[PDB]
């Protein structure tokens, strides 16, 4: 049973879905379950009581949204089962889980219990013929067509940098933080309350993400932007009430570089990139500096790559060619590589079959991934 | 190509100049 | 099969389920005569009800049982129900189920006492109490939209989105048609047309229905009234006497938009609706602005929809597209909604029963309502 | 110019004032501006037409009361300027604004625009030599004599838990919710309309606050009180008419713990107290649980501290020593600490001088408060 396999690119922010051997994912929607706050007195209302995908995006105001995954670690397992069921259902894929093999994704250095419980869901509740779990960095390099590359990614949950060299992922050189797009959006919300405009509800939270996506930029020199007085640019809500953002637009993404702003001493994006290259072997460093690949949504800020270059120039050894590459399709880079990996004939050997899972259990899944 | 989010005029990469 | 009985504070409306308009329409009055020791000839009724009290108005003390949507005298309300079922409708309450209506944010004891009278005294097979705004929205056809309901009892607002009522965004208002009628009667006394007794209360009410209209701009209308006498219309009474008033046409229903005239210290109907919409979630304001539904007799003044469009646009941001749904049949919108609710097949499982009432008691209605 | 400096403990419900080094604030009066509803025909009447303090409390029924400050954020700046002028005037303090330095108080995480506008008022309209804005939590600990401990507070405006360990306030663990005494009093009024005894006027609103203060209690188990039937205890109004309160007395202050009742998905007092402790670093958590300080008027409900402990026992880790301490004068906690802080010699270094404000501006105030 070797049908056209499915590529479920997981993530706390957005969940991409579709079939193998495609250019772009057809089914992209945000990873959250929406349930109504209010009472439904009047008949002919929105049925189901559980809202996932474009219905939830359309009807935010009703729904008390709650994210099942935080930092690539599913907290609420019932909510992810409903989302994965919604992905497979007639509203998106229009196919059964029994037909196609599954390509799952996870962030590196995650809890092994979550990986086991993920496999349990796909093998038992859904009846998958074969499952395979993979990393974000390996898939990003598949999409570009390279083998050598440091993959500095920045999603909604996790930021990390896996240094791969000619098809050799070094597991001990991996640097990871739990500071990313969601924490920047949460940090922007806190600033907007200090400015004046308060947002508190979960439906109301996604307005702050939309402000962060649209009107934010990274200053090349933050001390210079502090000393100077900002212009105070405007933004229109779905309501229509105007919001003067002020200095919070440039100070919000500084959480990525200075994680001491949230009050949680970590490395930072630029330090993680340097530390990943430094932890690897001596002869591999110059090739890893030349091949720096970007991916994820929190790399899309204005002047992000310019500042990320300047920080590498400050930290790294002098007179070395730094090249921070970044494709046009950064958001779907991880899905594209999964679709390419799924289309290859070697894919049949790498996966974990249902029969192999029933015999061995979790140990066989831990062996095949690494 | 089709889909909601893209960035126009960032470029593929930012590279330092190669010396002799 | 089912009967719909909109127990309004002014006009008590009633009829059958799945109908265009109600059969039984009359003012909810119980006129008791002048008790003097002198006798009365060839017999008479001790306490008149409905249209009989309106016909023989000159003598009878016209006391309304419902005051601000609150039943004060329950024996009086029991006589009006009896008059609705046996005399007007010509059908027993034991055979047919009975849909009732109360305004939102009413006393909790009133539903319990209303339901007790239906089951114990009248012996009804099944009953239900609905919100008036919910039925008014259901008569109009839309699932989404705020309803600025305004009768002689109580003005109130109930914002609803996609068949989900927002109970905490509801705003009941003490201003209503009866307070406007009393205000018109006072300003008539100021220009030498004194009406003290309750028989003249219905004449000034009838003057209010005919002549009065909502001003587009109040200060402009006051200036034109001083200059010209073309606006000064004449109304003849039941008696051959005829009277002429100039200022009092536009000035009477202005009390809705300026409660300071009556001495209430409350928000006007224009900004009460705005304040209701702002209390809702920020994402679902556009649809509430688009579907600003009106209902009841206090919204039957000419040019009220134009004044609501002027004031709501002035309060709200400039980007918003304001629109008032003002149908021709908005006077009887609450009853039409109840007739459509009774006609549906889903409503057959939503009734209260005799056996359920005997098990629980009056407190079961609060669960069934909303 | 170093005179005996003035303390002005700002608050939405009540405002408390006096001088440094005093045991209790001599001048406690409510923070609102009453203005007469009725017209003054007869001579020898109350002059001024703007009433603040005991005159306003004495003559409630005349005056249309309106609070300038909601949730520790002044909306009507002209009214707060009149209140501060009334504080300094001969009716209360009997002093000039030019002589004494000022200790102002504000809640944490407020709008910075209000803080700048507060400073402008004190430096320009009044001619203050030195101003200093401080936090309520830091002052409460000064009053008790401690340095360690979480300060849970709940006035009429804001409820916020600030964790401070040995003179180190953690700004990123400061939790805040806009669910305090005013919202409880507003929720009690809405319940009393459901009971039967409705209130609408602004002078009539302060009767609900008096009912909230006197006849209310927080039950330990809310589900057990819901199943049981209440006794309907009485309370006599300022007029004389009796009111059977019923279940509205105990369900009203439940708003503080369950903010879903009013219709706003927030944390609640007990969650905020736990969340503030959890946001801090691991080693400080056990000391923060052992030192919990209560403050404000909305901590004075019957069985509030017993419910707080039960909620901490439910949420917090097992086998940890919980201790919710409090001062005897819970309403005067923040002022006494300010009077202590003002009388210290270091206070000269902390404040923003008038010369420093004229040179720099708002930046120097943002540099000295935090």
């Amino acid at each position: 049973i070797a049908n056209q396999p499915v590529v479920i690119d997981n993530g706390s922010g957005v969940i991409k879905a579709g079939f193998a051997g495609d250019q772009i994912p057809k089914y992209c929607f945000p990873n959250y379950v929406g349930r109504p706050k209010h009472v439904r007195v009047m008949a002919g209302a929105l049925e189901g009581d559980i809202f996932i995908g474009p219905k939830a995006e359309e009807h935010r105001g009703l729904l008390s949204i709650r994210y099942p995954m935080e930092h690539g670690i599913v907290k609420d397992w019932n909510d992810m089962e409903r989302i994965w069921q919604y992905v497979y259902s007639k509203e998106q894929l229009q196919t059964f889980s029994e037909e196609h093999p599954v390509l799952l994704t996870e962030a590196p250095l995650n809890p092994r219990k979550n990986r086991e419980r993920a496999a349990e869901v796909f093998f038992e509740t859904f009846n998958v013929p074969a499952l395979f779990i993979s990393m974000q960095a390996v898939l990003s390099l598949y999409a570009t067509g390279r083998t050598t590359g440091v993959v500095l990614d920045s999603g909604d949950g996790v930021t990390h940098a896996v240094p791969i060299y000619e098809g050799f992922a070094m597991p001990h050189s991996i640097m990871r933080i739990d500071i990313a797009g969601r924490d920047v959006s949460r940090f922007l919300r806190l600033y907007l309350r200090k400015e004046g405009y308060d947002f508190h509800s979960s439906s109301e939270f996604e307005i702050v993400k939309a402000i962060k996506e649209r009107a934010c930029y990274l200053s090349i020199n933050p001390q210079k932007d502090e000393t100077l007085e900002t212009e105070k640019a405007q933004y229109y809500l779905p309501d229509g009430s105007t919001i003067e953002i002020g200095p919070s637009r440039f100070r919000a993404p500084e959480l990525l570089f200075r994680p001491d702003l949230i009050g949680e001493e970590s490395e930072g994006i630029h330090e993680v990139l340097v530390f990943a290259i430094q932890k690897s072997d001596m002869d591999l460093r110059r090739t890893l500096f030349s091949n720096i690949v970007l991916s994820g949504g929190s790399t899309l800020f204005k002047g992000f790559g310019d500042r990320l270059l300047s920080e590498v120039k400050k930290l790294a050894p002098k007179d070395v060619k730094i090249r921070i590459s970044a494709p046009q399709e950064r958001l779907y880079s991880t899905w594209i590589g999964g679709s390419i990996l799924a289309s290859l004939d070697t894919f049949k050997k790498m996966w974990v079959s249902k029969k192999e899972y029933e015999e061995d259990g979790a140990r066989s899944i831990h062996r095949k991934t690494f | 190509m089709a889909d909601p989010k893209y960035a126009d005029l960032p470029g593929i990469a930012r590279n330092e100049p190669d010396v002799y | 099969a089912a009967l719909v009985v909109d127990n309004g504070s002014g006009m008590c409306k009633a009829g059958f389920a799945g109908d265009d308009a109600p059969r039984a329409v009359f003012p909810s009055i119980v006129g008791r005569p002048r008790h003097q020791g002198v006798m009365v000839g060839m017999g008479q009724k001790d306490s008149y009800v409905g249209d009989e009290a309106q016909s023989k108005r000159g003598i009878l003390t016209l006391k309304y049982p419902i005051e601000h949507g609150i039943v004060t005298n329950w024996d009086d309300m029991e006589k009006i129900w009896h008059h609705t079922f046996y005399n007007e409708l010509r059908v027993a309450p034991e055979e047919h189920p009975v849909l009732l209506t109360e305004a939102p944010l009413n006393p909790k004891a009133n539903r319990e006492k209303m339901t007790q009278i239906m089951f114990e005294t009248f012996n009804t097979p099944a009953m239900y109490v609905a919100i008036q705004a919910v039925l008014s929205l259901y008569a109009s056809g839309r699932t989404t939209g705020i309803v600025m309901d305004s009768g002689d009892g109580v003005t109130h607002t109930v914002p609803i989105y996609e068949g989900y009522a927002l109970p905490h965004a509801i705003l009941r208002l003490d201003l209503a048609g009866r307070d406007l009628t009393d205000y018109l009667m006072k300003i008539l006394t100021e220009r030498g047309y004194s009406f003290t007794t309750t028989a003249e209360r219905e004449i000034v009410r009838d003057i209010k229905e005919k002549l009065c209209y909502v001003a587009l701009d109040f200060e402009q209308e006051m200036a034109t009234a001083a200059s010209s006498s073309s606006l000064e219309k004449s109304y003849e009474l039941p008696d051959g006497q005829v009277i002429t008033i100039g200022n009092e046409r536009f000035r009477c229903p202005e009390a809705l938009f300026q409660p300071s005239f009556l001495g209430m210290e409350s928000c006007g109907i224009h900004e009460t609706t705005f304040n209701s919409i702002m209390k809702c979630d920020v994402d679902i304001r556009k649809d509430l602005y688009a579907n600003t539904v009106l209902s009841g007799g206090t919204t039957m003044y000419p040019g009220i929809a134009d004044r609501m469009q002027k004031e709501i646009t002035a309060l709200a941001p400039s980007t918003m597209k304001i629109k008032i749904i003002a149908p021709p049949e908005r006077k009887y919108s609450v009853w039409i909604g109840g007739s459509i609710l009774a006609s549906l097949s889903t409503f057959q499982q939503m009734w209260i029963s005799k056996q359920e009432y005997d098990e629980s008691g009056p407190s079961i209605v609060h669960r069934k309502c909303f």
Side-chain angles (χ1 to χ4, degrees), chain A, chain B residues 1-4 6-7 10-14 17, chain C:
Chain A
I1 181 159
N3 297 38
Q4 189 172 20
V6 178
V7 183
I8 300 163
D9 190 279
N10 274 294
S12 57
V14 183
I15 172 158
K16 315 107 182 83
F19 298 103
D22 293 53
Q23 292 186 341
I24 290 182
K26 303 298 292 189
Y27 316 116
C28 299
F29 70 97
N31 187 248
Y32 60 80
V33 179
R35 316 184 209 174
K37 299 163 190 184
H38 323 282
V39 184
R40 48 172 180 78
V41 180
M42 195 176 192
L46 298 163
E47 298 176 39
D49 311 341
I50 312 185
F51 291 73
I52 313 92
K55 290 187 174 185
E57 291 182 309
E58 191 170 34
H59 311 296
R60 287 208 207 79
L62 297 175
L63 307 168
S64 54
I65 296 164
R66 42 154 51 192
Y67 298 100
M69 274 183 150
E70 265 192 324
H71 316 308
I73 307 169
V74 44
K75 301 291 187 285
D76 296 39
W77 273 102
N78 287 259
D79 290 315
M80 281 304 302
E81 282 180 46
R82 293 167 201 179
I83 290 163
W84 290 330
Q85 191 175 122
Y86 164 75
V87 168
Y88 276 119
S89 186
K90 295 177 181 181
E91 294 181 306
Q92 207 75 245
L93 274 167
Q94 303 179 324
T95 51
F96 297 89
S97 58
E98 294 170 36
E99 296 187 43
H100 312 281
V102 188
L103 170 50
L104 208 67
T105 66
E106 286 190 340
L109 316 179
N110 284 13
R112 291 178 173 177
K113 288 188 172 185
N114 288 55
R115 200 196 219 79
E116 291 171 25
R117 192 74 174 78
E120 283 172 41
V121 165
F122 278 98
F123 286 125
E124 302 181 6
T125 63
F126 308 113
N127 290 34
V128 163
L131 181 65
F132 181 62
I133 302 160
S134 60
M135 323 317 286
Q136 294 189 18
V138 173
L139 275 41
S140 75
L141 298 178
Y142 274 127
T144 57
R146 303 184 176 181
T147 55
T148 56
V150 179
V151 186
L152 190 290
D153 73 284
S154 308
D156 195 49
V158 198
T159 48
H160 58 273
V162 185
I164 302 162
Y165 179 77
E166 306 187 313
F168 283 90
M170 312 179 223
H172 313 118
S173 303
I174 297 166
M175 296 293 292
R176 178 186 142 104
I177 328 161
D178 302 340
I179 210 81
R182 189 167 290 175
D183 294 302
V184 177
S185 187
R186 197 182 288 98
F187 192 74
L188 203 150
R189 182 175 67 172
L190 193 78
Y191 255 75
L192 288 171
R193 187 159 70 169
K194 293 171 169 184
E195 296 300 329
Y197 311 97
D198 67 320
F199 300 128
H200 47 261
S201 187
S202 57
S203 60
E204 204 169 35
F205 185 74
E206 299 223 300
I207 289 161
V208 179
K209 284 176 64 260
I211 293 157
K212 191 199 74 171
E213 288 169 24
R214 188 171 196 76
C216 278
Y217 75 105
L218 273 158
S219 57
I220 298 160
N221 295 324
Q223 294 181 356
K224 297 293 100 180
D225 285 49
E226 195 284 293
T227 49
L228 297 168
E229 192 170 33
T230 193
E231 301 187 322
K232 303 191 174 183
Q234 294 185 328
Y235 175 83
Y236 287 99
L237 294 182
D239 174 42
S241 300
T242 317
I243 286 162
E244 297 174 36
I245 303 160
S248 56
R249 54 143 68 182
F250 87 88
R251 295 183 184 179
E254 294 290 307
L255 178 55
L256 300 179
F257 290 80
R258 284 194 193 183
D260 297 37
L261 299 171
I262 198 77
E264 183 168 311
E265 58 183 305
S266 312
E267 296 89 337
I269 278 182
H270 74 278
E271 295 200 49
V272 151
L273 216 176
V274 171
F275 276 42
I277 299 158
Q278 286 175 335
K279 281 189 175 185
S280 57
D281 295 44
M282 276 294 307
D283 295 48
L284 311 182
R285 299 193 187 178
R286 210 153 194 171
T287 54
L288 290 162
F289 271 116
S290 62
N291 296 36
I292 292 169
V293 184
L294 300 186
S295 52
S298 305
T299 59
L300 306 177
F301 290 94
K302 297 172 187 175
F304 168 82
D306 292 59
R307 175 153 176 163
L308 192 59
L309 263 179
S310 69
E311 291 289 345
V312 172
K313 283 189 173 180
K314 288 161 183 178
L315 273 166
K318 298 171 186 175
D319 307 350
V320 183
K321 185 160 185 180
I322 310 153
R323 252 184 64 191
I324 301 176
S325 56
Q328 294 180 356
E329 292 165 45
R330 267 187 286 184
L331 289 161
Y332 312 141
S333 286
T334 54
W335 192 95
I336 290 157
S339 185
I340 294 155
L341 179 53
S343 63
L344 290 163
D345 295 33
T346 53
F347 193 62
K348 295 144 190 171
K349 298 181 180 179
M350 277 95 75
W351 65 43
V352 199
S353 57
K354 195 183 183 178
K355 190 172 68 261
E356 185 61 29
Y357 178 66
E358 286 170 24
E359 289 171 23
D360 295 36
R363 295 184 299 173
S364 57
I365 299 157
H366 294 309
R367 199 196 308 103
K368 286 176 163 68
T369 190
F370 278 102
Chain B
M1 286 287 289
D3 270 60
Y6 269 132
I12 301 106
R14 321 208 142 71
Chain C
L3 295 165
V4 186
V5 180
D6 186 1
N7 289 119
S9 304
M11 299 298 294
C12 178
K13 303 168 284 288
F16 294 95
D19 276 37
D20 296 28
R23 295 174 171 283
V25 187
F26 57 93
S28 58
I29 303 166
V30 279
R32 270 163 280 188
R34 300 172 199 288
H35 274 290
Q36 307 184 51
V38 294
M39 63 141 55
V40 60
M42 289 182 184
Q44 54 150 225
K45 297 171 71 174
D46 187 45
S47 304
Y48 296 94
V49 192
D51 67 322
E52 293 292 319
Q54 202 64 200
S55 300
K56 302 188 283 289
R57 177 158 69 261
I59 287 189
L60 302 174
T61 53
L62 306 194
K63 290 191 177 75
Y64 291 88
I66 313 176
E67 199 168 27
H68 311 289
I70 322 294
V71 178
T72 58
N73 200 320
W74 277 108
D75 295 315
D76 295 12
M77 193 74 259
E78 195 184 311
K79 286 171 173 171
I80 288 172
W81 270 312
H82 186 277
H83 179 266
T84 321
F85 287 112
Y86 296 107
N87 199 53
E88 292 288 312
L89 296 163
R90 299 181 176 177
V91 57
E94 294 171 309
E95 278 60 31
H96 295 240
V98 281
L99 179 55
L100 306 177
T101 66
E102 67 145 50
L105 302 170
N106 230 51
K108 292 175 81 269
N110 288 36
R111 282 212 208 82
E112 293 184 323
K113 199 78 187 294
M114 180 175 288
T115 304
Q116 187 184 313
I117 291 159
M118 289 284 159
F119 287 127
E120 300 194 327
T121 311
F122 281 70
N123 305 320
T124 53
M127 70 93 65
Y128 190 92
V129 192
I131 303 163
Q132 295 175 339
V134 172
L135 300 178
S136 289
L137 197 64
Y138 197 44
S140 71
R142 301 149 194 75
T143 53
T144 306
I146 194 166
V147 174
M148 208 292 291
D149 196 289
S150 305
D152 76 308
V154 47
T155 295
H156 60 89
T157 54
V158 184
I160 312 184
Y161 179 86
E162 300 291 310
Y164 275 84
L166 312 175
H168 304 116
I170 293 171
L171 274 162
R172 193 201 185 82
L173 202 76
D174 296 34
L175 285 84
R178 184 163 291 105
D179 297 16
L180 303 183
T181 310
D182 289 21
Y183 185 68
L184 180 56
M185 195 167 65
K186 202 192 81 175
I187 64 189
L188 278 160
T189 318
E190 291 171 23
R191 290 182 72 267
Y193 300 114
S194 305
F195 295 132
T196 54
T197 189
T198 55
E200 308 304 293
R201 199 92 163 284
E202 306 302 318
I203 292 162
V204 67
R205 179 181 143 284
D206 195 51
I207 289 161
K208 196 187 72 165
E209 295 192 40
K210 288 205 184 186
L211 305 179
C212 299
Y213 70 105
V214 179
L216 197 73
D217 185 30
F218 182 64
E219 293 176 39
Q220 183 264 1
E221 280 292 331
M222 188 175 169
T224 54
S227 299
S228 300
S229 306
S230 187
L231 182 61
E232 182 168 309
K233 279 188 182 293
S234 316
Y235 170 88
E236 193 177 313
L237 311 183
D239 183 32
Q241 178 57 208
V242 59
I243 65 101
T244 64
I245 69 190
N247 280 235
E248 287 67 26
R249 292 180 63 188
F250 66 86
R251 191 179 184 182
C252 159
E254 186 60 32
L256 295 168
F257 303 97
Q258 292 184 35
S260 59
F261 292 122
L262 310 189
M264 300 229 68
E265 206 202 328
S266 302
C267 296
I269 63 168
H270 72 276
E271 76 197 326
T272 302
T273 317
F274 171 74
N275 289 317
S276 308
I277 295 156
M278 298 295 272
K279 280 183 185 294
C280 313
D281 199 294
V282 73
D283 295 57
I284 59 161
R285 293 188 184 180
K286 288 198 77 171
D287 295 37
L288 296 168
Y289 282 122
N291 298 340
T292 308
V293 177
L294 304 184
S295 55
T298 323
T299 57
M300 297 291 287
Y301 293 92
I304 193 163
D306 294 29
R307 180 58 175 283
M308 288 282 283
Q309 192 157 229
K310 182 168 177 176
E311 292 275 31
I312 294 163
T313 303
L315 292 158
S318 59
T319 53
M320 288 288 97
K321 183 167 183 176
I322 308 304
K323 176 176 281 185
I324 293 90
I325 283 63
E329 313 95 324
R330 78 182 91 81
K331 192 166 180 171
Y332 312 130
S333 268
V334 174
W335 188 90
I336 291 159
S339 189
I340 303 156
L341 180 54
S343 70
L344 279 197
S345 302
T346 317
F347 195 59
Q348 268 59 24
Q349 308 301 328
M350 207 173 288
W351 293 97
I352 302 157
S353 59
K354 265 282 192 169
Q355 68 191 331
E356 284 177 319
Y357 178 73
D358 291 17
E359 285 175 319
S360 297
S363 302
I364 197 166
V365 179
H366 297 288
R367 302 173 209 173
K368 298 284 186 180
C369 198
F370 54 92

